[PDB]
From a paper:
The membrane-anchored SNARE (soluble N-ethylmaleimide-sensitive factor acceptor protein receptor) proteins provide the energy to drive membrane fusion in various cellular contexts, such as intracellular trafficking and exocytosis. Supercomplexes of NSF, α-SNAP, and either a syntaxin tetramer or one of two binary complexes of syntaxin—SNAP-25 reveal atomic details of SNARE processing and show how sequential ATP hydrolysis drives disassembly. NSF comprises three structured domains connected by flexible linkers—the adapter N-domain followed by the D1 and D2 AAA+ domains.
A representative 22bin20S model (class #19, 3.56 Å) and ɑ-SNAP—2:2 binary SNARE subcomplex model (class #23, 4.14 Å). A Hexameric NSF engages the ɑ-SNAP—2:2 binary SNARE subcomplex via N-domains (salmon), which engage three ɑ-SNAP molecules (gold) surrounding the soluble, 2:2 binary SNARE complex composed of two syntaxin H3 domains (dark red) and two SNAP-25 SN1 domains contributed by two separate full-length SNAP-25 molecules (green). A portion of a linker N-terminal to one syntaxin H3 domain is observed within the catalytic D1 ring of NSF (light blue). The D2 ring of NSF (purple) shows no substrate density. B NSF (light blue) engages one of the two syntaxin molecules (dark red) in the 2:2 binary SNARE complex via pore loop interactions involving Y294 (protomers A–F, indicated). Substrate-bound reconstructions reveal a flattened D1 ring in closer proximity to the D2 ring and a strikingly different ɑ-SNAP—SNARE spire structure than observed in the 21bin20S complex under non-hydrolyzing conditions. Even without further processing, this structure was recognizable as a parallel 2:2 syntaxin—SNAP-25 sub-complex formed by two syntaxin H3 SNARE domains and two SNAP-25 SN1 SNARE domains; this binary 2:2 configuration was previously observed in crystal structures of syntaxin-1 H3 and SNAP-25 SN1 domains and was unexpected as we prepared the complex with full-length proteins, implying that two independent SNAP-25 molecules contribute their SN1 SNARE domains to this complex. Except for the rebinding F protomer described above, all other D1 protomers are ADP bound with variability in the presence of Mg2+ and inorganic phosphate (Pi); in most cases, protomers C and D have ADP•Pi and Mg2+, protomer B is usually ADP-bound, and protomer A is always ADP-bound.
Residue numbers in the entry:
A (entry chain B): 212 to 424
B (entry chain C): 205 to 740
C (entry chain D): 425 to 740
D (entry chain H): 181 to 214
The structure:
Amino acid sequence: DWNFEKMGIGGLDKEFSDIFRRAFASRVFPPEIVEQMGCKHVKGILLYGPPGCGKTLLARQIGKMLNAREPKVVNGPEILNKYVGESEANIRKLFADAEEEQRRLGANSGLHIIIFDEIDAICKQRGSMAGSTGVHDTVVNQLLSKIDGVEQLNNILVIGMTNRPDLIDEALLRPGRLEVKMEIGLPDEKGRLQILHIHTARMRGHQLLSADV
Amino acid sequence: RQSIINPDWNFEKMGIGGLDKEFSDIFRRAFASRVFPPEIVEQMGCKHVKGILLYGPPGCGKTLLARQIGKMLNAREPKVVNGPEILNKYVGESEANIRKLFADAEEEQRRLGANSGLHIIIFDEIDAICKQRGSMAGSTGVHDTVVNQLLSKIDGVEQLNNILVIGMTNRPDLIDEALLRPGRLEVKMEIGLPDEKGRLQILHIHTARMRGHQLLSADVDIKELAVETKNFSGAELEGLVRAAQSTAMNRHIKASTKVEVDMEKAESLQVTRGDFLASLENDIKPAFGTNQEDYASYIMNGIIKWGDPVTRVLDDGELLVQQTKNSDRTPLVSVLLEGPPHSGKTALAAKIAEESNFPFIKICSPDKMIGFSETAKCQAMKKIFDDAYKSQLSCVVVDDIERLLDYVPIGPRFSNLVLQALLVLLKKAPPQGRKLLIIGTTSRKDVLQEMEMLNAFSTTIHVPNIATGEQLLEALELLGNFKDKERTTIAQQVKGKKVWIGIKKLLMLIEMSLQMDPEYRVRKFLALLREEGASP
Amino acid sequence: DIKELAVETKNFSGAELEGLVRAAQSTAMNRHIKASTKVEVDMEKAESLQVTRGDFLASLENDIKPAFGTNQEDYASYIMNGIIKWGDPVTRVLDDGELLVQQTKNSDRTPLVSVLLEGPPHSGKTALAAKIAEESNFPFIKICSPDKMIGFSETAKCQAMKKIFDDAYKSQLSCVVVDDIERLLDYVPIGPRFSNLVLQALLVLLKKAPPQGRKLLIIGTTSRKDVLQEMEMLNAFSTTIHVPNIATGEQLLEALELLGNFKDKERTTIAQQVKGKKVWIGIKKLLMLIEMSLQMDPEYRVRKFLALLREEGASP
Amino acid sequence: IIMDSSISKQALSEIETRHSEIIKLENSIRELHD
Ligand SMILES: Nc1ncnc2c1ncn2[C@@H]1O[C@H](COP(=O)(O)OP(=O)(O)OP(=O)(O)O)[C@@H](O)[C@H]1O
Ligand SMILES: Nc1ncnc2c1ncn2[C@@H]1O[C@H](COP(=O)(O)OP(=O)(O)OP(=O)(O)O)[C@@H](O)[C@H]1O
Ligand SMILES: Nc1ncnc2c1ncn2[C@@H]1O[C@H](COP(=O)(O)OP(=O)(O)O)[C@@H](O)[C@H]1O
Ligand SMILES: Nc1ncnc2c1ncn2[C@@H]1O[C@H](COP(=O)(O)OP(=O)(O)O)[C@@H](O)[C@H]1O
Ligand SMILES: [Mg+2]
Ligand SMILES: [Mg+2]
Ligand SMILES: [Mg+2]
Ligand SMILES: [Mg+2]
């Protein structure tokens, strides 16, 4: 029981058709045909644009749109400890449930969502030409080694929100990990009309808005 | 002898295409002595190799090859390390974790002697822990201890003969030197971009199940896809096929505000060429290939032929391209395009580059280096050229050389590191038999000649301005502006004089003279032209 | 033959030799196997396995590479298109180099000798130091070129040069090449500007005798002699050698004949219009005008070559 | 502005008779043996 009219979003009526054509299209078709096709589902999305334009809203709404289990949340720089080898434990703890479910059952586990906020904060470019950045290298490696690795996962999906698309490590933005990327820009007139309607509908309901407005 | 190889393993089952030579080499050097009868090996008295390393650009098939080779051998299961997964905070616990990997082989050797089974160990992302033994100054020191433990356990006082270690990395220059001698890690391989046959084999491999169930329409032709995509890695091909399938499936599904599926279209499901072309145009974008956006921001308003001097530049560019494509003894040729300012010399370079059909084309322009220091500019240029060195052909454009050096007439002043990193990069030949071509643009030739930078460049082409009034009339006619009697009067006032104006300035004078009423456009145009035409 | 392998391998350590032997064994063994859809090993030809010398050379040239000193790849990279003989001025340089290298091995009063090759640009100096270094058959040979130090600051260049020179004090006798000096210590006519630390390091390293009883030979190349003379550096080098350009029609004809281009009638056609004047062109440019010319139709070839040569016309 | 730190722990000489079994010793001495 869900329709877009109850989502609460207004204006991003075209930047949502794609995200429901490349990320979820292969989980609603009859399973037998998809199995006969032998394809693998996408496991990443990246949203970017100016600040304060409706990004986190899409995250919550997409998270609760599916029957998926309740989203986890990593709050950017909340995974930086001080002892040696403590950030990696925090990173690894996210995929424990996914791995356990993938091992127990097979091709039947429910979708697991991991909402990643301020991706640019930690996932900086690894760099080269001698010199060690510090702890960022280890975190980046431990992250790149889990989404795609010797052991295969097919019941996960990662969402990343940031406003600087050209400060993220290039090895992370390749087909197979964080493939689909979208831009959410300022809205034109119709967007403003829909936004105002959505935000004033409640008051208009109870005859609390004068007819002069 | 129970064959180390699994009783049933055929190369067709592995599913790897385009890596035949590398796999043959690996099998020959790391598996040959375990399949030959044992008595002759005992007589010869040799010790088996115990190391393999893989490196290359991301997304070319390293972890696939490692996993498949690990699965080939029917002897136990691999022991994986997922990166920096062996690390703790208590003193002296990383070394214990490292030591727990080799324990089983140590125990088994003594019990069984010389009939043990191969024990494999995979070291995904090796460059996270093993680095130069003393290049990390300031840390607690776990790196040095880990490196020493690994070195002392692979080849120490006691000897093992039933292990095999595989490593993967993207930067095969930070790894320790003492770990890459003929004792520990011998066979080192590079996984590079495939050629036409590799792409054909990969596309055959991936789109096979769909062929089995008649889910692929006969309209599709594989050879066209193989030829049409150049410098695509395997992951990009997989993404292309997946995007095509996704579009085909989404075609049938109906409605988004209320999910609905129609079985009538579902039963008859097929993918056609149109989906493939749409996916190629819109979704997938290679990294080592050519992009269609670089040529839409520089050559903005097409190229018109206002006279004779326009065709000569293109012809000479074609001649240079042909020279660099079909000859040896000359694998690196460069050319300099120069002329007065506002003449249109940054569009001709782009057009010449685009008309070459080279797989790899790149433009290095100062638009993307605002505020950078000297070192940042040097690093950026070095990275561009390093990427260019990884293809069979290439073409690199250097735009507005005088702005890279940071020149200024007063003083004068400029950067020196950039000048040298540019002067020594115009004579370094590419590795092996790989070609290259460099096209530079400038507007002040004398200053460059005074810097002794005219020896590096192998030739020079001159881009002239509009000189004869007839050329101006031709340009005005071709641009689609004042015509009929208006044209006539302009001619009457222009033929009896000389004109000296660039082509980028005419497009601005015309547009500036069109904002008046429809009675004074000609007069304003002539006044502006007279005020601007300082014939030198 | 064991002695051939002993002589060929240079700067090998024991592990390297063991690896070479093992690789040769594996290559010899691989013939019997048939890595078809199923792995098969022949049991008839087996027991007749024999290791041949060709296998040893193949393993040497494909699957083993030492890590102390230069290797054939660098030599093939620098001296690229061979060393032709366009006249007498080619043999003189090699003879002088031979005399110098002979001196730096049978004497003890002078355990350090330095020489400098000078001439006009695009004349073939970096491909005559390599040949002299190679023909000496010294145990340790290293080349210090500035294309491996792109973007380095002054200190990094100093450290790299110091390390390369320290690697040469732990051998019995060695040769070191410093090519393109004018680019090691950045120089640009405007100003002038340059690095001072590099100049001081070089000027102190060129007069530092090695430990007791060991010898060294330094060969340096440059293109602008006068600037070096003006830095008070040209009284530190022991001697000097001059590398000239093609300066006569007969030498141009000889070079064209030996390179293998413009044969038969076209050669006489060129001779007609070339014998009536003198020429001034280096040997590296002459290998580029030829390639530029050989791109037109089967006809209209000599015309373009002569035109390009005429345009590139100057003199001292 | 960064410094990763390692730690070292120590065990405790857990004693069964340092409390609640000194009372049990009394229950064994003053009561059971009495
Ligand atoms: N025949 C032509 N040749 C070149 N450019 C042309 C021609 N016809 C039209 N143009 C347009 O003229 C402009 C060419 O000059 P451009 O805008 O690239 O600047 P430029 O020559 O690099 O200038 P600057 O020297 O000031 O950096 C482009 O808009 C190009 O579309
Ligand atoms: N007799 C010869 N002597 C030297 N080089 C020759 C001779 N014959 C052919 N060559 C070729 O000439 C080239 C050597 O010239 P090289 O590029 O080293 O000149 P250079 O003076 O060092 O240049 P620059 O100062 O511009 O860097 C090589 O291709 C070599 O094959
Ligand atoms: N497309 C939209 N339609 C309706 N409201 C929006 C939209 N985009 C943003 N908003 C409003 O912005 C507020 C906060 O947005 P927020 O999630 O903070 O965006 P961001 O995370 O990009 O700053 C929400 O309360 C919401 O009402
Ligand atoms: N030679 C190949 N043959 C077939 N598929 C390949 C080949 N190389 C890469 N691929 C495909 O592309 C992907 C490569 O990713 P992978 O190699 O696992 O990552 P990485 O390159 O970082 O090791 C795989 O999913 C595989 O399907
Ligand atoms: Mg937010
Ligand atoms: Mg991988
Ligand atoms: Mg320009
Ligand atoms: Mg030189």
